[PDB]
């Protein structure tokens, strides 16, 4: 039904893309429904190398436990495959609550660029919570402009 | 332009989902153009991994890889990871310009985790971005439930070459039915 089709939107900032040496600097989270309407906003936490990593994982895991069913909803965001690699390593209990599938907005951007080049030319941050809001609007823009 | 807009399709079969322990046992590669037209079939290799790792696999892994004939073909293989990487890197360099084409497939971020660790030179030839057919699958389920039911059931056994052809068939299905 509608609940199993909710999305767990995230945005993360790291020191780099090397999973062995880089760390999660900032993170934000929010839930939407299947039609991208924001149901709830999670926290916007800056992590030390302000709060520690293990506490952010508790904060974020609490937030999604009260908003989504266990192991059902996918992680959503722009280049969220880069974010999932770091969440699978540094927040494994948070990732245990989600599905293995992602709703990656940059996959949709790559298809828009190839298949709908005019729409792509006119396709549309200080916090990680603002970067999520921008990705939702980008995903909503593709739904209206390139999907049937 | 057109050569930079080609897609690098990949399917892996591993001994499990543990990046710290598990290894790659099968790999297939295929190239399509921007519009998902079939351009070229790449290698389809079964990579040799120890008997300890195969006997200590998950109950799902032992049963699915056993029935498919993969665990038997892995024990008989003479292909190392280094040998397969070289064959896969060679093939994509003949097909695509460096660092411009994405990796494509179903939840291909999991295949990228294993390729980033075990075939880093093959990943250096591809762009940063991926084409995850499972993102489009999730949006189809949600926004196009009728079309989603009409999509064909994944009929392939976990053989890299058969799996990669079905991910292409699945993205083509979405392009044909849920895109403008
Ligand atoms: Mg696979
Ligand atoms: Zn498979």
């Amino acid at each position: 039904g509608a609940m199993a089709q909710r999305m767990v939107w995230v945005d993360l900032e790291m020191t780099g893309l090397d999973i062995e040496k880089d760390q999660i600097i900032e993170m934000a989270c929010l839930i939407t429904d299947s039609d991208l309407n924001i149901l709830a906003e999670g926290p916007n936490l800056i992590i030390k190398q302000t709060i520690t990593l293990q506490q952010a994982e508790y904060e974020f895991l609490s937030f999604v436990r009260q908003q989504t069913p266990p192991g059902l909803c996918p992680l959503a965001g722009n280049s969220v495959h880069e974010d999932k690699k770091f969440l699978d390593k540094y927040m494994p209990q948070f990732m245990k609550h989600l599905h293995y599938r992602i709703i990656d907005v940059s996959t949709v951007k790559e298809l828009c660029r190839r298949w709908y080049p005019e729409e792509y030319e006119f396709a549309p941050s200080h916090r990680a919570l603002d970067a999520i809001s921008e990705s939702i609007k980008e995903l909503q823009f593709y739904r209206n402009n390139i999907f049937k």
Side-chain angles (χ1 to χ4, degrees), chain A residues 18-84:
Chain A
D18 185 10
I19 194 60
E20 300 309 326
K21 304 300 185 178
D22 293 298
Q23 260 73 32
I24 303 172
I25 303 167
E26 190 184 348
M27 180 168 163
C29 179
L30 72 77
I31 285 76
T32 74
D33 58 4
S34 62
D35 299 325
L36 314 183
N37 300 303
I38 294 155
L39 304 181
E41 290 192 2
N44 181 88
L45 311 176
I46 296 78
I47 294 153
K48 296 179 193 283
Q49 302 211 337
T50 300
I51 207 175
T52 68
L53 173 58
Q54 198 178 348
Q55 200 63 44
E57 186 179 1
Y58 167 68
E59 287 290 329
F60 289 123
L61 177 53
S62 304
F63 175 62
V64 300
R65 283 235 61 175
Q66 80 205 1
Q67 295 309 141
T68 65
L72 265 302
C73 301
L75 202 72
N78 255 303
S79 275
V80 80
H81 59 269
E82 297 171 350
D83 301 8
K84 178 161 181 292

Side-chain angles (χ1 to χ4, degrees), chain A residues 61-117:
Chain A
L61 177 53
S62 304
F63 175 62
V64 300
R65 283 235 61 175
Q66 80 205 1
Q67 295 309 141
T68 65
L72 265 302
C73 301
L75 202 72
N78 255 303
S79 275
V80 80
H81 59 269
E82 297 171 350
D83 301 8
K84 178 161 181 292
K85 194 178 210 191
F86 282 76
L87 290 168
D88 282 345
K89 176 162 185 184
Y90 297 96
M91 297 197 185
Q93 203 65 21
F94 172 74
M95 292 304 305
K96 232 164 273 188
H97 188 76
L98 310 182
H99 209 285
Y100 67 87
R101 281 175 195 152
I102 64 176
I103 288 174
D104 179 35
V105 187
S106 39
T107 282
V108 189
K109 180 184 225 205
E110 281 305 327
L111 297 178
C112 185
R113 186 177 76 74
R114 291 177 159 76
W115 308 339
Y116 299 88

